Amino acid sequence: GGLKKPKKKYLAGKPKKIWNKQLLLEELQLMGEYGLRNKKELWLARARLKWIVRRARALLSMTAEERAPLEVPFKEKLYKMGFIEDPNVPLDRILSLDVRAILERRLQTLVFRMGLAKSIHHARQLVVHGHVLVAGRRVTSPGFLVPRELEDKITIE
Amino acid sequence: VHLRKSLAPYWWPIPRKAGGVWAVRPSTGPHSLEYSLPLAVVVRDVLRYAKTLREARYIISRGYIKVDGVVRKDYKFPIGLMDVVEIVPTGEIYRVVPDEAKYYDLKPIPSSEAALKPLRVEGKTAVSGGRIQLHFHDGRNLILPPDVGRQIKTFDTVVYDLENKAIKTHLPLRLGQLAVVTHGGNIGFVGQFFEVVWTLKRRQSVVALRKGEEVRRTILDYIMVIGTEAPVVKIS
Amino acid sequence: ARGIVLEKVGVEARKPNAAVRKCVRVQLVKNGKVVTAFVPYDGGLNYINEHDEVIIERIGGPEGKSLGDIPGVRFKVVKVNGVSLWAIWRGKKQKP
Amino acid sequence: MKLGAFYKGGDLVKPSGGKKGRVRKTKKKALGGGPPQIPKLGEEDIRYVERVRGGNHKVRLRQARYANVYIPKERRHVKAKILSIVSSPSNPDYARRNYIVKGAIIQTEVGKAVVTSRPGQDGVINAVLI
RNA sequence: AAACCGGUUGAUCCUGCCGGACCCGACCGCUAUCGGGGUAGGGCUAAGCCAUGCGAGUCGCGCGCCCGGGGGCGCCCGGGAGCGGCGCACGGCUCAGUAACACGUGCCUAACCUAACCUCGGGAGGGGGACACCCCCGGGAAACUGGGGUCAAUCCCCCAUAGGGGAAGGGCGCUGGAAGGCCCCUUCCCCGAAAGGGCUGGCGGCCGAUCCGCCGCCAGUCGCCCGAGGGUGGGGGCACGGCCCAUCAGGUAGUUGGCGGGUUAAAGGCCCGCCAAGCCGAAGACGGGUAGGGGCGGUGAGAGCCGCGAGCCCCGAGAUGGGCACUGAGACAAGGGCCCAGGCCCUACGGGGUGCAGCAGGCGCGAAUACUCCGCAAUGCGGGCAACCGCGACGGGGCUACCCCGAGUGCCGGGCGAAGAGCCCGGCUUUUGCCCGGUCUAAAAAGCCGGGAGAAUAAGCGGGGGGCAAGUCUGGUGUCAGCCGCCGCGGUAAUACCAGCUCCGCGAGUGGUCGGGGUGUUUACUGGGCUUAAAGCGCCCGUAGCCGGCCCGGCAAGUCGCUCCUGAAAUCCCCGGGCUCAA
Ligand SMILES: [Mg+2]
Ligand SMILES: [Mg+2]
Ligand SMILES: [Mg+2]
Ligand SMILES: [Mg+2]
Ligand SMILES: [Mg+2]
Ligand SMILES: [Mg+2]
Ligand SMILES: [Mg+2]
Ligand SMILES: [Mg+2]
Ligand SMILES: [Mg+2]
Ligand SMILES: [Mg+2]
Ligand SMILES: [Mg+2]
Ligand SMILES: [Mg+2]
Ligand SMILES: [Mg+2]
Ligand SMILES: [Mg+2]
Ligand SMILES: [Mg+2]
Ligand SMILES: [Mg+2]
Ligand SMILES: [Mg+2]
Ligand SMILES: [Mg+2]
Ligand SMILES: [Mg+2]
Ligand SMILES: [Mg+2]
Ligand SMILES: [Mg+2]
Ligand SMILES: [Mg+2]
Ligand SMILES: [Mg+2]
Ligand SMILES: [Mg+2]
Ligand SMILES: [Mg+2]
Ligand SMILES: [Mg+2]
Ligand SMILES: [Mg+2]
Ligand SMILES: [Mg+2]
Ligand SMILES: [Mg+2]
Ligand SMILES: [Mg+2]
Ligand SMILES: [Mg+2]
Ligand SMILES: [Mg+2]
Ligand SMILES: [Mg+2]
């Protein structure tokens, strides 16, 4: 008798104890470097990071036969998004993946890391006002997680 | 009578969520609701000739579509296994055949085998005059004299002439023929009949098919004999 | 629940503390039972009158029972005449 | 007929003897029944054709005078006449009120016969001589 | 992230509760710019009462009549009131009854019916009638309704034959696991079809402009009747599965079964006549309480717990309470009928209507709630040969802090300011707000594309003694007022109250009270404890239950492995793709 409704997708990266000093210090650093809007964006990055790690955890627990069809395609898909660097690492190497690798794929970060803007908050403003063309199309969402192949197509107006 | 989109058969080539809350309901024709597709769905989805339901009804209303030699002007007419669908103004012919992916597919066929339909004998009844009536997998019937109808047992496949209302060729169900699975998980598979575990109910007998050397098993109910090493009519 | 204020009554804080927590007696409309409701905030009792509809709500505390030094009271006033008491106390609105 | 006065639906009693509630408030018309229509001994035959479920028809004998008595020892059928109802083993009150039911004895012209049809349902009295 | 932290002591180790931190659901407070996706909204409250409107029609290719325009061959077209066919038993709403063959899964009907439709085989001959609209009159407040005349049918009826039912005897034969079945033969009884109708074209004949038809035939097409099967819908049956209470222990008497009957479409104590004493129960009857069942949903690392098991889909039941019938394939019928109860409404006092658990809407209750809006374009359905028509189903938007997703409320440099806020200066951009055009949309709206001015139009909520991030800064009060989930403060120097300044958390949100889960190994299967903290019956005999020595042989029930038919869709996990990414 229950009707399904959507739930928050950033809950997996949300800490259940927000009032930790060292926790507040580390997260405040991350928002500063990458110019995020609120902690929801930061938690949304971690929720992606938990997916990549929890999926890799389960694939380790799967049998060798079961792991085989999914092992290489999983690493290859991670490589193409730009999270990882080698798509041929051991599967346990993905377990130590760090949340900054997901934050670098944000479209706002790439505009700043490509020297296309003065500051990271300026690069967010560039995407917001619609001066950043991704393969010729205006992509105005600064939190866009650009994959590897699309990265070289980023231009300004 | 309505048909909610949720209650539509799973294998139908329509989106499950996106669309209206309704689906076109077949009008009790020569098939089963679970194993038939209405004519308006075929004209709109499988052939893509109509973009709306009114356009599909318009195409059907002109008699452009022929199903087994009879022009069907009903947009809720059911189509099913081994049916011959012919589009008059374009001249294309299809035979709805068991498919490994779509579960039921419109395959083009040559014009020669368009009047032929392979029918599986579902049973026989004794009618007045002492004659025998044959019931086929799509509910079609054929009355025969008693001696000729004695030698056609159930599950035998007969190639039926829609043009002459006759039996071209009778294919008995014996071990060693070519069979196609017409229902169940193993649909679309064509292979040799080489193994049977005869149960107390013959319709529930376990049968095995081989294609060198992928072996699939089903029940005896779910396989149609299509002949010896050469299939009699194009199905794949 | 809703209720009608009858008399402004004062209960005394428990032994270690010393104060007169100012509550009111309310009769519930849906039941007719009479309950003692705590009026919070400094001067919040002054916004209460006799025969005014107030929205009665639980005071919190463990297990839905009474609060810390207030003995035997389970409810507190949140609304007076259809306006929130915190709004009146903060000046953001005025009582009707 | 389908009459709620002769409802043929299930009891409200469990096999343990305890009572159970009513799942359905109304009496379904499909589960309805009808009053008896077994014929009475009369001076002429009157047949009534009744429309029943699905647009079908049932032949009702309102008043019975002749019986199609059959002689097993001779293999002949005679449309003999009926004089009295000797006895009704299912219920004597059928014979007491001159009502013919299956299994009843009838003292026909040829002798005695046991009624071998359901005269409220078949609509004729097929009899076999004793 | 498989997590702990506060509090009983002078101090300590425990036990054990209560609190904090998290997610979701309802209601509420303060605040509130934009967009996208979504089956969110009087459910958790009275199945309480209702003003008003809209909510099932369609067919002239079944039928006659009337009217208007046109034309001569035999009519064309438009319209009207009707008869007639089919549909209105689908669709929409709600959750009282129900602890039950209601629901779920897996099987049956060899004990059954089914209009529309599909296939095979066969048939369509003879003869009659009535009633509407209409015309001449009405009656009545209205509802409704009377008499005479008069034209038809795919309207109604009869006759024939086919066919059908029953009883009885026989059989090679069929189906099927198995014939009380089908087929064939014989005897009797009984019931008993049809619309060759419409259209199109061709032929011929009768007839006449006061007719614009009628008749025979042929073909095409849409139809009608019978037999058999299928299909669909439905009636019925079975095995098993899913709440609490013993401060409820015996219950049942058509009750349990048998035989013979009636009724039914069909089996049945469904009902009836007779016969017996059986049937259920501590493996929990009976009684009470609660509840529509499922797909499923929330929460947790999981086992599990809970139902927010309201919204979407499937089944069920209901239409103010309780009953009973007509028609029909199907109802004992939400916008049909009749009766009782209980209301209300109009009235000319003689009557006649009505019950919104339909879509809007009003009153009422309550802590708690939307427009008396637009369209049949999409998705479907009924009707039609078709064209097309209708549809508060459905689609569209409005309102609403409904759920999720993406953003703004500026960016760069400089000075003052503190490295903050803020102020000012110089340069930049226009997401967004405003105006306009194209596109979109049934039409709007919003979206999208493009153009103009412009920093210009846009931040709150809760907190700073510990738990727990944030002030031993200042003013005021002085165990008063106030705070406080717990611990605990305040009685003159208050980091806990009221204020200023300042800082903290989250941010178009943030809080308060509730409910569920975690918390919690405080329900313990995983996985607790019982000497003394709560907890071994005072002791023993034993029924059900649970648990039980060794070896050999058999079966293969459990169990294990593979495969098949299944376990609706949606929901869930993984993978690919398409909306700018996202949802
Ligand atoms: Mg306390
Ligand atoms: Mg835990
Ligand atoms: Mg102490
Ligand atoms: Mg607790
Ligand atoms: Mg309600
Ligand atoms: Mg017609
Ligand atoms: Mg008309
Ligand atoms: Mg009509
Ligand atoms: Mg319904
Ligand atoms: Mg008359
Ligand atoms: Mg007729
Ligand atoms: Mg028969
Ligand atoms: Mg006749
Ligand atoms: Mg006639
Ligand atoms: Mg019987
Ligand atoms: Mg009984
Ligand atoms: Mg609703
Ligand atoms: Mg009633
Ligand atoms: Mg009714
Ligand atoms: Mg009502
Ligand atoms: Mg439409
Ligand atoms: Mg958001
Ligand atoms: Mg400075
Ligand atoms: Mg517009
Ligand atoms: Mg503040
Ligand atoms: Mg302060
Ligand atoms: Mg601290
Ligand atoms: Mg505090
Ligand atoms: Mg314990
Ligand atoms: Mg002892
Ligand atoms: Mg004791
Ligand atoms: Mg013992
Ligand atoms: Mg076994």
PDB file of N, CA and C (backbone and C1' of nucleotides) in Angstrom, chain E residues 249-263:
ATOM      1  P     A E 249     -11.609 -18.928  30.392  1.00  0.00           P
ATOM      2  O5'   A E 249     -12.025 -20.028  29.320  1.00  0.00           O
ATOM      3  C5'   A E 249     -13.394 -20.276  29.031  1.00  0.00           C
ATOM      4  C4'   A E 249     -13.661 -21.711  28.636  1.00  0.00           C
ATOM      5  C3'   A E 249     -13.359 -22.783  29.686  1.00  0.00           C
ATOM      6  O3'   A E 249     -14.359 -23.786  29.589  1.00  0.00           O
ATOM      7  C1'   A E 249     -12.266 -23.316  27.681  1.00  0.00           C
ATOM      8  P     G E 250     -15.222 -24.230  30.862  1.00  0.00           P
ATOM      9  O5'   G E 250     -15.839 -25.640  30.430  1.00  0.00           O
ATOM     10  C5'   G E 250     -16.916 -25.739  29.502  1.00  0.00           C
ATOM     11  C4'   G E 250     -16.535 -25.188  28.151  1.00  0.00           C
ATOM     12  C3'   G E 250     -17.597 -25.186  27.071  1.00  0.00           C
ATOM     13  O3'   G E 250     -18.567 -24.173  27.230  1.00  0.00           O
ATOM     14  C1'   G E 250     -15.567 -25.916  26.154  1.00  0.00           C
ATOM     15  P     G E 251     -20.024 -24.369  26.595  1.00  0.00           P
ATOM     16  O5'   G E 251     -19.781 -24.230  25.032  1.00  0.00           O
ATOM     17  C5'   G E 251     -19.406 -22.988  24.462  1.00  0.00           C
ATOM     18  C4'   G E 251     -19.292 -23.089  22.966  1.00  0.00           C
ATOM     19  C3'   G E 251     -20.527 -23.569  22.232  1.00  0.00           C
ATOM     20  O3'   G E 251     -21.490 -22.554  22.048  1.00  0.00           O
ATOM     21  C1'   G E 251     -18.640 -24.698  21.404  1.00  0.00           C
ATOM     22  P     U E 252     -23.005 -22.946  21.704  1.00  0.00           P
ATOM     23  O5'   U E 252     -22.895 -23.840  20.392  1.00  0.00           O
ATOM     24  C5'   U E 252     -22.615 -23.255  19.129  1.00  0.00           C
ATOM     25  C4'   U E 252     -22.747 -24.258  18.012  1.00  0.00           C
ATOM     26  C3'   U E 252     -24.063 -25.005  17.939  1.00  0.00           C
ATOM     27  O3'   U E 252     -25.102 -24.246  17.356  1.00  0.00           O
ATOM     28  C1'   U E 252     -22.297 -26.533  17.697  1.00  0.00           C
ATOM     29  P     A E 253     -26.533 -24.179  18.071  1.00  0.00           P
ATOM     30  O5'   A E 253     -27.304 -25.443  17.499  1.00  0.00           O
ATOM     31  C5'   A E 253     -27.594 -25.542  16.115  1.00  0.00           C
ATOM     32  C4'   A E 253     -28.271 -26.843  15.784  1.00  0.00           C
ATOM     33  C3'   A E 253     -29.632 -27.063  16.440  1.00  0.00           C
ATOM     34  O3'   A E 253     -30.466 -27.817  15.558  1.00  0.00           O
ATOM     35  C1'   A E 253     -28.167 -28.787  17.076  1.00  0.00           C
ATOM     36  P     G E 254     -31.311 -27.088  14.400  1.00  0.00           P
ATOM     37  O5'   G E 254     -30.265 -26.102  13.708  1.00  0.00           O
ATOM     38  C5'   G E 254     -30.471 -25.586  12.397  1.00  0.00           C
ATOM     39  C4'   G E 254     -29.265 -25.809  11.515  1.00  0.00           C
ATOM     40  C3'   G E 254     -29.410 -25.307  10.087  1.00  0.00           C
ATOM     41  O3'   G E 254     -28.109 -25.045   9.557  1.00  0.00           O
ATOM     42  C1'   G E 254     -29.180 -27.638  10.057  1.00  0.00           C
ATOM     43  P     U E 255     -27.114 -24.003  10.263  1.00  0.00           P
ATOM     44  O5'   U E 255     -26.342 -24.865  11.356  1.00  0.00           O
ATOM     45  C5'   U E 255     -25.611 -26.021  10.981  1.00  0.00           C
ATOM     46  C4'   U E 255     -24.762 -26.559  12.108  1.00  0.00           C
ATOM     47  C3'   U E 255     -23.942 -27.792  11.766  1.00  0.00           C
ATOM     48  O3'   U E 255     -22.714 -27.457  11.152  1.00  0.00           O
ATOM     49  C1'   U E 255     -25.060 -28.125  13.826  1.00  0.00           C
ATOM     50  P     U E 256     -22.467 -27.760   9.603  1.00  0.00           P
ATOM     51  O5'   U E 256     -21.908 -29.243   9.589  1.00  0.00           O
ATOM     52  C5'   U E 256     -20.584 -29.522  10.004  1.00  0.00           C
ATOM     53  C4'   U E 256     -20.354 -31.004  10.114  1.00  0.00           C
ATOM     54  C3'   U E 256     -20.937 -31.849   8.997  1.00  0.00           C
ATOM     55  O3'   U E 256     -20.156 -31.845   7.819  1.00  0.00           O
ATOM     56  C1'   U E 256     -21.498 -32.813  11.058  1.00  0.00           C
ATOM     57  P     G E 257     -20.870 -31.927   6.387  1.00  0.00           P
ATOM     58  O5'   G E 257     -21.278 -33.455   6.253  1.00  0.00           O
ATOM     59  C5'   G E 257     -20.276 -34.450   6.157  1.00  0.00           C
ATOM     60  C4'   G E 257     -20.826 -35.834   6.381  1.00  0.00           C
ATOM     61  C3'   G E 257     -21.862 -36.328   5.396  1.00  0.00           C
ATOM     62  O3'   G E 257     -21.303 -36.738   4.164  1.00  0.00           O
ATOM     63  C1'   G E 257     -22.559 -36.851   7.576  1.00  0.00           C
ATOM     64  P     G E 258     -22.237 -36.873   2.871  1.00  0.00           P
ATOM     65  O5'   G E 258     -23.134 -38.139   3.202  1.00  0.00           O
ATOM     66  C5'   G E 258     -22.544 -39.406   3.435  1.00  0.00           C
ATOM     67  C4'   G E 258     -23.603 -40.456   3.617  1.00  0.00           C
ATOM     68  C3'   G E 258     -24.683 -40.459   2.551  1.00  0.00           C
ATOM     69  O3'   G E 258     -24.306 -41.194   1.403  1.00  0.00           O
ATOM     70  C1'   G E 258     -25.691 -40.451   4.675  1.00  0.00           C
ATOM     71  P     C E 259     -24.859 -40.775  -0.039  1.00  0.00           P
ATOM     72  O5'   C E 259     -26.392 -41.192   0.009  1.00  0.00           O
ATOM     73  C5'   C E 259     -26.768 -42.552   0.161  1.00  0.00           C
ATOM     74  C4'   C E 259     -28.263 -42.697   0.265  1.00  0.00           C
ATOM     75  C3'   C E 259     -29.075 -41.963  -0.785  1.00  0.00           C
ATOM     76  O3'   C E 259     -29.153 -42.646  -2.019  1.00  0.00           O
ATOM     77  C1'   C E 259     -29.977 -41.518   1.333  1.00  0.00           C
ATOM     78  P     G E 260     -29.421 -41.817  -3.366  1.00  0.00           P
ATOM     79  O5'   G E 260     -30.883 -41.222  -3.167  1.00  0.00           O
ATOM     80  C5'   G E 260     -32.027 -42.055  -3.249  1.00  0.00           C
ATOM     81  C4'   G E 260     -33.300 -41.264  -3.096  1.00  0.00           C
ATOM     82  C3'   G E 260     -33.483 -40.102  -4.054  1.00  0.00           C
ATOM     83  O3'   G E 260     -33.964 -40.507  -5.321  1.00  0.00           O
ATOM     84  C1'   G E 260     -33.983 -39.395  -1.865  1.00  0.00           C
ATOM     85  P     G E 261     -34.050 -39.449  -6.522  1.00  0.00           P
ATOM     86  O5'   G E 261     -35.228 -38.471  -6.094  1.00  0.00           O
ATOM     87  C5'   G E 261     -35.402 -37.213  -6.720  1.00  0.00           C
ATOM     88  C4'   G E 261     -36.093 -36.240  -5.803  1.00  0.00           C
ATOM     89  C3'   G E 261     -36.076 -34.787  -6.242  1.00  0.00           C
ATOM     90  O3'   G E 261     -37.085 -34.495  -7.184  1.00  0.00           O
ATOM     91  C1'   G E 261     -35.486 -34.935  -3.961  1.00  0.00           C
ATOM     92  P     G E 262     -36.761 -33.570  -8.448  1.00  0.00           P
ATOM     93  O5'   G E 262     -36.846 -32.091  -7.874  1.00  0.00           O
ATOM     94  C5'   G E 262     -38.054 -31.574  -7.342  1.00  0.00           C
ATOM     95  C4'   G E 262     -37.819 -30.257  -6.653  1.00  0.00           C
ATOM     96  C3'   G E 262     -37.169 -29.178  -7.499  1.00  0.00           C
ATOM     97  O3'   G E 262     -38.118 -28.467  -8.265  1.00  0.00           O
ATOM     98  C1'   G E 262     -36.096 -29.311  -5.391  1.00  0.00           C
ATOM     99  C1'   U E 263     -33.717 -25.305  -7.310  1.00  0.00           C
ATOM    100  C3'   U E 263     -34.872 -24.382  -9.173  1.00  0.00           C
ATOM    101  C4'   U E 263     -35.879 -24.743  -8.079  1.00  0.00           C
ATOM    102  O3'   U E 263     -35.258 -23.175  -9.821  1.00  0.00           O
ATOM    103  C5'   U E 263     -37.070 -25.549  -8.527  1.00  0.00           C
ATOM    104  O5'   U E 263     -36.596 -26.700  -9.262  1.00  0.00           O
ATOM    105  P     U E 263     -37.646 -27.847  -9.668  1.00  0.00           P
TER     106        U E 263
END
